Design an enzyme around this catalytic site. Sequence first.
Site, PDB file in Angstrom:
ATOM      1  N   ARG A 161     -48.592 -51.353  20.401  1.00 45.90           N
ATOM      2  CA  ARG A 161     -49.855 -52.097  20.373  1.00 45.90           C
ATOM      3  C   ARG A 161     -50.802 -50.671  20.612  1.00 45.90           C
ATOM      4  O   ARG A 161     -51.858 -50.557  19.660  1.00 45.90           O
ATOM      5  CB  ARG A 161     -50.145 -52.915  21.426  1.00 45.90           C
ATOM      6  CG  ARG A 161     -51.659 -53.560  21.431  1.00 45.90           C
ATOM      7  CD  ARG A 161     -51.979 -54.115  22.795  1.00 45.90           C
ATOM      8  NE  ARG A 161     -52.828 -53.525  23.550  1.00 45.90           N
ATOM      9  CZ  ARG A 161     -51.999 -52.727  24.658  1.00 45.90           C
ATOM     10  NH1 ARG A 161     -51.052 -52.463  24.787  1.00 45.90           N
ATOM     11  NH2 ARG A 161     -52.846 -52.063  25.612  1.00 45.90           N
ATOM     12  N   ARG A 162     -50.642 -49.780  21.347  1.00 52.15           N
ATOM     13  CA  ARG A 162     -51.353 -48.665  21.727  1.00 52.15           C
ATOM     14  C   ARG A 162     -51.226 -47.523  20.567  1.00 52.15           C
ATOM     15  O   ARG A 162     -52.009 -46.996  20.491  1.00 52.15           O
ATOM     16  CB  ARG A 162     -50.910 -47.915  23.076  1.00 52.15           C
ATOM     17  CG  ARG A 162     -51.523 -48.883  24.353  1.00 52.15           C
ATOM     18  CD  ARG A 162     -50.747 -48.466  25.513  1.00 52.15           C
ATOM     19  NE  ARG A 162     -51.105 -49.365  26.880  1.00 52.15           N
ATOM     20  CZ  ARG A 162     -50.340 -49.199  27.942  1.00 52.15           C
ATOM     21  NH1 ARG A 162     -49.372 -48.251  27.940  1.00 52.15           N
ATOM     22  NH2 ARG A 162     -50.913 -49.915  28.668  1.00 52.15           N
ATOM     23  N   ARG A 214     -40.722 -43.344  28.637  1.00 49.08           N
ATOM     24  CA  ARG A 214     -40.001 -44.321  29.311  1.00 49.08           C
ATOM     25  C   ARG A 214     -39.802 -43.964  30.789  1.00 49.08           C
ATOM     26  O   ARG A 214     -40.153 -42.855  31.165  1.00 49.08           O
ATOM     27  CB  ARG A 214     -38.409 -44.355  28.848  1.00 49.08           C
ATOM     28  CG  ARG A 214     -38.487 -45.504  27.684  1.00 49.08           C
ATOM     29  CD  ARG A 214     -37.154 -45.741  26.941  1.00 49.08           C
ATOM     30  NE  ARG A 214     -36.747 -44.439  26.190  1.00 49.08           N
ATOM     31  CZ  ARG A 214     -36.728 -44.697  24.893  1.00 49.08           C
ATOM     32  NH1 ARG A 214     -37.472 -45.460  24.285  1.00 49.08           N
ATOM     33  NH2 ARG A 214     -36.429 -43.515  24.219  1.00 49.08           N
ATOM     34  N   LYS A 244     -48.573 -60.155  30.874  1.00 45.70           N
ATOM     35  CA  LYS A 244     -48.160 -59.472  29.613  1.00 45.70           C
ATOM     36  C   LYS A 244     -46.576 -59.785  29.502  1.00 45.70           C
ATOM     37  O   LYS A 244     -46.255 -59.825  28.656  1.00 45.70           O
ATOM     38  CB  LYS A 244     -48.328 -57.849  29.612  1.00 45.70           C
ATOM     39  CG  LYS A 244     -49.761 -57.629  29.817  1.00 45.70           C
ATOM     40  CD  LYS A 244     -50.096 -55.929  30.082  1.00 45.70           C
ATOM     41  CE  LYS A 244     -49.112 -54.994  29.181  1.00 45.70           C
ATOM     42  NZ  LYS A 244     -49.385 -53.562  29.579  1.00 45.70           N
ATOM     43  N   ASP A 245     -45.939 -59.563  30.674  1.00 43.89           N
ATOM     44  CA  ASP A 245     -44.620 -59.625  30.732  1.00 43.89           C
ATOM     45  C   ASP A 245     -43.961 -61.163  30.812  1.00 43.89           C
ATOM     46  O   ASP A 245     -42.912 -61.430  31.033  1.00 43.89           O
ATOM     47  CB  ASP A 245     -44.088 -58.849  31.952  1.00 43.89           C
ATOM     48  CG  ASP A 245     -44.302 -57.449  32.096  1.00 43.89           C
ATOM     49  OD1 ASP A 245     -44.087 -56.819  31.372  1.00 43.89           O
ATOM     50  OD2 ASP A 245     -45.443 -57.234  32.750  1.00 43.89           O
ATOM     51  N   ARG A 258     -43.331 -41.451  34.433  1.00 38.10           N
ATOM     52  CA  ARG A 258     -44.096 -41.065  33.405  1.00 38.10           C
ATOM     53  C   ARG A 258     -45.224 -39.923  33.783  1.00 38.10           C
ATOM     54  O   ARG A 258     -45.224 -38.993  33.008  1.00 38.10           O
ATOM     55  CB  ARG A 258     -44.777 -42.252  33.138  1.00 38.10           C
ATOM     56  CG  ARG A 258     -44.274 -43.409  32.424  1.00 38.10           C
ATOM     57  CD  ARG A 258     -45.096 -44.652  31.846  1.00 38.10           C
ATOM     58  NE  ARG A 258     -44.744 -45.309  30.557  1.00 38.10           N
ATOM     59  CZ  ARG A 258     -43.955 -46.074  30.441  1.00 38.10           C
ATOM     60  NH1 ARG A 258     -43.418 -46.574  31.460  1.00 38.10           N
ATOM     61  NH2 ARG A 258     -43.650 -46.571  28.827  1.00 38.10           N
ATOM     62  N   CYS A 296     -43.613 -58.117  24.324  1.00 35.30           N
ATOM     63  CA  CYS A 296     -44.412 -56.619  24.147  1.00 35.30           C
ATOM     64  C   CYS A 296     -43.896 -55.892  22.987  1.00 35.30           C
ATOM     65  O   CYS A 296     -44.627 -54.810  22.820  1.00 35.30           O
ATOM     66  CB  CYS A 296     -44.434 -55.930  25.532  1.00 35.30           C
ATOM     67  SG  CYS A 296     -44.847 -56.988  26.973  1.00 35.30           S
TER      68      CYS A 296
END
Length: 281
Positions: free
Chosen positions: A109-110, A127, A61-62, A133, A220
């Site tokens: 996206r989520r 964040r 993803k990164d 989190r 992202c």
Amino acid sequence: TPIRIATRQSPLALWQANYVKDALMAAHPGLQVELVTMVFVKELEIAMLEGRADLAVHSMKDVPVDFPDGLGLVTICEREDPRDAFVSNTYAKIEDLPSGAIVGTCSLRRQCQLKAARPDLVIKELRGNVGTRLSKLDAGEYDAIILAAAGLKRLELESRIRSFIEPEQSLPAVGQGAVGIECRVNDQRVRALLAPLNHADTADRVRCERAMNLTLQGGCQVPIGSYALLEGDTIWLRALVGEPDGSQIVRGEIRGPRTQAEQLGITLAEQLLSQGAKEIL
Ligand SMILES: *Cc1[nH]c(Cc2[nH]cc(CCC(=O)O)c2CC(=O)O)c(CCC(=O)O)c1CC(=O)O
Ligand SMILES: [Mg+2]
């Protein structure tokens, strides 16, 4: 001389770095591997260019859209759980959340997929690292939070998963759950060592997911789901682009020959662009 792995200090980065390190030593008996801690992945690539490092471990993803001259992504490991996880102390899954519940996520996206199914939900920013989190969730700042299933499983945090959000409910980010490895292209010593760690099935899937993403947009920051299974030698690719507030969602599908995997994504992306995916920005 010991093979050096450039990695961040974060728990997830440290885990992935050690994963490849262990995998290298298992595949190559007597091989010496060590980790080099650093300090925006640019800093990691510079170290490899400056010969202060050999390979670097990334979550797919990164992985950036552009590789500096001399580098590139040559290896993709066996894929972990690709989908999203629903994390709450007071609730089980999404549909069990009251109307107007507060669900922390920083992912476009989520977020866009949640607002699509349930616009009533109040989506708040999230964040900090994985532990930070969870720390906020226990503080009651959120009714629930949505994290990647892979990250929690790798941290032995698996007990924090109340429910697995299926790709149908929330489409995974490109290469989610998949760990890639970056190194110097012309370094043959390293290329030969990273070869056994490469998983062919996983490789074709993510490289198919990337091409789709690359055509539309990078990073992202963009609300784009990209996910692909493989049925036998056939690759099933699903792509998603939608408004962050859950106004309209553009979905698409295609089924691959295994070899055309990179060509599939760029065609499906072009297919979506003609369907209004470009107008989304
Ligand atoms: C790409 C972008 N990075 C973040 C956080 C992130 N990146 C990789 C992982 C681990 C999953 C894996 O190994 O594939 C994570 C942790 C995670 O919760 O996914 C995410 C956004 C997370 C957020 O809280 O906003 C993604 C963005 C995205 O998935 O859309
Ligand atoms: Mg972390």
